[PDB]
Design a binder for this molecule. Sequence first.
Ligand code: HEC
Ligand code: HEM
Ligand code: HEM
Ligand code: HEM
Ligand code: HEM
Lengths: 247, 126, 93, 93, 385, 385, 57
Amino acid sequence: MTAAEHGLHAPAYAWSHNGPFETFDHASIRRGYQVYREVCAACHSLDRVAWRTLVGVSHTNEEVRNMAEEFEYDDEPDEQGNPKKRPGKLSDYIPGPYPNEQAARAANQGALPPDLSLIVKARHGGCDYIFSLLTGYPDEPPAGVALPPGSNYNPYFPGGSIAMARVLFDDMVEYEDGTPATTSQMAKDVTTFLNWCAEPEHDERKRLGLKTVIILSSLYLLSIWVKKFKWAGIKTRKFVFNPPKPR
Amino acid sequence: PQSFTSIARIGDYILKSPVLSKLCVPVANQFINLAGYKKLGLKFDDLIAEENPIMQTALRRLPEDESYARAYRIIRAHQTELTHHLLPRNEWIKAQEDVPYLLPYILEAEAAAKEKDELDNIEVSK
Amino acid sequence: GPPSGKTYMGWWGHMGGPKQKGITSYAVSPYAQKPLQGIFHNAVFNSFRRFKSQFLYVLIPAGIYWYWWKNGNEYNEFLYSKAGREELERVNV
Amino acid sequence: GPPSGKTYMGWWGHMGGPKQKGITSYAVSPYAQKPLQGIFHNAVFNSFRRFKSQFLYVLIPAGIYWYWWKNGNEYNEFLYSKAGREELERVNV
Amino acid sequence: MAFRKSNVYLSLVNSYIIDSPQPSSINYWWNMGSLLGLCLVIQIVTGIFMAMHYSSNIELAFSSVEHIMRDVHNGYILRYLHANGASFFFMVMFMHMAKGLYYGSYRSPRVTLWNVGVIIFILTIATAFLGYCCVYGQMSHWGATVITNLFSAIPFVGNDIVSWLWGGFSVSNPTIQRFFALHYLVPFIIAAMVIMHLMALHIHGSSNPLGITGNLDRIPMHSYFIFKDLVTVFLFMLILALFVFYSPNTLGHPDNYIPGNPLVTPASIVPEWYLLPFYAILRSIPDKLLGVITMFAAILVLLVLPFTDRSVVRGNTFKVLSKFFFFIFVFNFVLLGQIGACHVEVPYVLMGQIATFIYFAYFLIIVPVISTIENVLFYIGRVNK
Amino acid sequence: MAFRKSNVYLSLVNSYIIDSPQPSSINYWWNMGSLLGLCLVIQIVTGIFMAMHYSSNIELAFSSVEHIMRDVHNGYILRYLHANGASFFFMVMFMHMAKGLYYGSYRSPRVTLWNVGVIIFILTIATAFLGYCCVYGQMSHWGATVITNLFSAIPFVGNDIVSWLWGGFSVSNPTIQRFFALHYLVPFIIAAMVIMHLMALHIHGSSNPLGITGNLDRIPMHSYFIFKDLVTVFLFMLILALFVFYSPNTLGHPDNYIPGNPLVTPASIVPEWYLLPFYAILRSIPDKLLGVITMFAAILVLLVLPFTDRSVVRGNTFKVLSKFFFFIFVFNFVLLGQIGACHVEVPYVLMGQIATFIYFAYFLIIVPVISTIENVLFYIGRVNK
Amino acid sequence: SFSSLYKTFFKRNAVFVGTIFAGAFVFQTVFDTAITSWYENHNKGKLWKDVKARIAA
Ligand code: HEC
Ligand code: HEM
Ligand code: HEM
Ligand code: HEM
Ligand code: HEM
């Protein structure tokens, strides 16, 4: 198809976790959770990420146990039979803002805001695409294109017209530690947090990968040596043919 | 898969007519020395597949000296392909000693088996 | 056991090959030899010999098919551009 | 193939049995015979012969174990009645 | 005699992997079968340890898969080993088939071996398809419904067999339970077919990369070829550990991680990358009846290859034009896999049709003509009459 | 030679089921192996066509079984064939083992056949237990947690093993998914073990009901013993069709149709009836670790039976005392299975202890004494010195 | 003095596989601790323990 229906290819940014030895910036994961809680939690669900994965990564155990109390969850009904509600504990999932799909479509002019738990893993480009899509809203669409009303223009979205308005403005949140909150800083922090949500096994996976490729490379070289050793009796055999005497 | 009588017939017709000969044998000589079975020290009649009945009888009818030289050339080709080298320039099979030695036995064995096949599918005039 | 049909490979001792005589085979135990004998010479010389003998058969068809694929891909990227819409509808209908 | 270890059964022709001589074996094709030849005579008489020869070895252990099981079951049904509750405590401790 | 030749099971493992007389001249291309056996048992082991956690409903399939990805201890390793060892299984299998039809191991004494290998290839394509359709993403569900919707092209019984195969009226919960049961079941047919493959090999011996007979100079399997296989096993484990640990999702499509919704079509329904030449063959011609039987004939046109090659010399090791046209066919297969990933567009439909015509004409038109030409060329270059 | 003897797969099928020389005088007890092979294929086929609909969660296991029973076409047939063919499988297996240890086919040329058979018996007890705990009823869940709480009696290691085996802290969703994966997996190990059983038999040939050599006049397998197998296959199919169609639930417990609730205990936690003698051997002695190791010794004390028989005549056909004591042992096994179904009560605990002592003393104490007595009696009755 | 090393390490197979297993023990624990100390020293300023000490200080 044409390039407008393909979507503009997102560039190759220099992330802090692009590399065979680098890990996630966990301060960026903490700041990205603050950006997700204050900005993206009005539309987007995140329901494959429990509260217990959040400890030891971005917040501490007391902070996550204090953050889980602010939401109510379905508890099994009491002695009479009528249902009860309870404050959340560490085992429950992070709650979505909309109770079903139909309210999510009704509160966003028909467009369902997708679940963000696997959103940098289920897109072509990944974190580069998410960051450039967040920062890629122009102040005006180009001269000639016509959009349906209520639909905003974003060139990195495949199709040209996304139904999500530009939300990341300057000084929308103020951070807990003192980093300045621009649109690019907030965008980078929230997509590093989305990459942590899509792959929590990143650090452990790359460490076990370092172990496995060191062990298997040394094993490959030693097996090459022992193959040449066991085959040195065959690579240097010599054949001598004197012609036999006739009968 | 292809009978050697047919290959011999097409090759004889290509050879003994002088228009096709001077056009077909130079590219055949270039194809043979580009193939590279002589750099391993092999005649061509070692390369033929020995798992037909025709080739098995044509090998069991081979004389006792050419059979031993054939076995040595096959084993030497196996070894110098094992070590991933080639034979040196002294031990290359020259083009004048790439004589077809198995081909009369192959031709007469396939002629005998062919004659059996069309003698037992014969019909008297009815 | 049941003796099944004849095959073109026996076992050790009767392999079904032709009878051989006068082929003496010398070999030395690897504990008396050196492994990694001349691996630099056979790394930059014999490998270059094998690569020189076997690169035209690989790099002529790869070149043909890669040039065909690049020409087709660039023609498609030209046709779905701004300067190729009338040729798009002309080649379609 | 590999000729493995010898066993006490070969195949047809060399079965590993003893050499025999002078044992003539006459048979008749079933199309010349009548199947179901003597099924009522051998159903009444030969079946009674086999039952007569091999029923004590089956019925004496079955009788022993069935009488043991019936006596134990009726003793348990006696004990968990009301006329055995003092015996129930005495057998308990 | 020894206990490894006297005892029954030790006699079978002796005659297969200890003193199997292998030909002496075989290079590192003969190790792909040992590599395929190792990778098959790797797939089976990681599949069982994933099926201990996988729940096969339709509102629990994708969430159970991403529960394996997040909650079970060392389960991301298991899912990446499965999903990348399948791709490595198919690439090593393609190298096995390319060696088998380059060195002439489809020839006269092992057509039984070649046909049983083609049967294993069909069963392996089938179970990889079922395993890709039991994870239930967006590419999974839509690929399943597109494959069966073109399987409904049979004129009299098409809708009957496709609603027997769906277990309903479109791809849903009975289709996903059915596909998980079949995705178990077909690899344990593949294992018995591998046993039959090994028997049909062992009764005639392996070929060698020269075409000449190997009964003169041979080598037992144990102290030499086990270590050759060990070298390439550790090399394959190195490449597989790289592709599992440092870049897992560079082989799969980035749309299988969207949960399967049968109301949104993801605008191109490319399957997994090794089914792409057959997908391009399937989308070559416009109608789908001839398309599905052309895909089936593209798979079972490897069977025509023994009865078709007319050269008296086994294998293309000592030939010129056969090497040239073989590598033309191989890079045509790579181009067909490339065309299978792009949309239905302006050079792409014509390039797919020409590429599948060259793929179908290599087996039927190109190889007997050039083999006959090389036979008579050998004869007229050798004989001076 | 013939094509059924030349072709490699057909030579195997020929040498095993066509012209395998069977002894001329074998009666209807030697058809139990063919019956066991048929019933194993029956179990596998009906299991696959049930696992296409069975979902193995904790919220969907019993609901999916009663969805198979009520809504899928001819699903009552499939579930009753599985749940009754398992019982018939174990009864024909008990007949196979009792024939094997009555006619003396544990003796000197087929001890490896007997050991492979004992391995098959362990594996099928294991997969039968896993299948009984797939369905998740009231007998199912509590029988699972009773014998895994039994399995946690290992002193240093036991709680760690049992919370690795449960996949948690009690029998729940990971245990049921684990048990479904293992209940699929183990019969495809039993298929390989039955192939091993057939090889270890075929190297030596079957025994006859006399002890004497069958090597004199034998009979080919195809036109005679296939039809004897056909007679017993149609009789077994008739009895199985009766027990499937006219009284399906007369074998299983009438408490497995209560859904598995891990709060209430049903006051009688007996398993399915083929595990009842081993459950009685378990509940015999009051300690628990000694109980599970004497259950395992009751299983693999059939391995001391080749080494403990001192009779110079093969088989109990021409013996009297060992006939009597063998039938004592068989009816003791039936009484042990009867005791395993009752509560631990007033004559039942003593009857279970005495019955398991007679079970353990038939193999160790009774059989070499009476075999030695019979050997000496035969000698002093024959010779006159 | 290589007959010393051969006689006490490589002569019988029992001492061979014994020292292979003991070397597997020692090598694997010190290798995993060395590689995790290098992996947690290559990333200083990014790990959770460092940012926890940073927000505490
Ligand atoms: C509503 C009040 C929203 C706020 C604040 C944010 N988003 Fe959003 N988003 C919203 C809708 C209604 C949609 C659907 C648009 C469509 O056509 O699909 C979206 C879409 C996304 C997507 C998907 C883009 C794609 O190519 O699939 C992403 C990745 C996304 N949104 C992320 C996102 C982030 C990171 C935000 C804040 C930090 C955020 N959104 C705010 C509605 C709203
Ligand atoms: C023939 C060998 C096999 C191949 C080629 C194969 C291939 C695949 C592939 C490609 C997938 C999809 C992975 C993805 O989502 O990207 C898959 C999924 C799966 N396979 Fe297999 N498979 C094989 C054997 C098995 C076996 C024998 C089992 C069962 C024991 C199994 C269990 C699974 C399961 C549970 C999934 C679900 C999705 C997941 O968790 O990854 N596989 N298979
Ligand atoms: C599950 C997949 C497979 C396994 C495990 C397997 C296994 C093997 C093994 C171990 C060998 C011996 C090693 C060798 O000769 O290279 C072999 C040989 C062979 N296989 Fe396969 N194979 C598989 C699939 C296939 C396929 C798909 C084909 C092609 C149709 C095939 C055709 C062959 C041929 C022709 C040979 C003989 C090669 C020769 O001797 O020259 N196999 N196979
Ligand atoms: C060794 C042969 C087998 C035996 C003895 C066996 C035995 C059993 C038994 C006793 C049950 C419980 C039935 C009940 O609820 O009363 C069961 C359940 C089950 N078995 Fe098997 N089984 C065997 C093989 C298989 C195989 C290979 C499969 C899978 C293909 C399978 C699939 C099932 C399923 C799905 C259940 C679930 C409950 C049901 O619907 O019956 N079985 N098995
Ligand atoms: C899956 C279950 C089994 C199958 C399919 C099976 C299959 C067979 C078959 C077909 C035979 C030959 C026919 C016969 O001689 O009766 C046989 C013989 C035998 N089986 Fe099994 N069997 C099984 C289980 C067992 C078990 C549990 C044992 C005992 C531990 C056992 C011990 C034997 C013995 C000793 C023989 C030789 C009988 C003789 O030749 O006198 N088998 N088996």
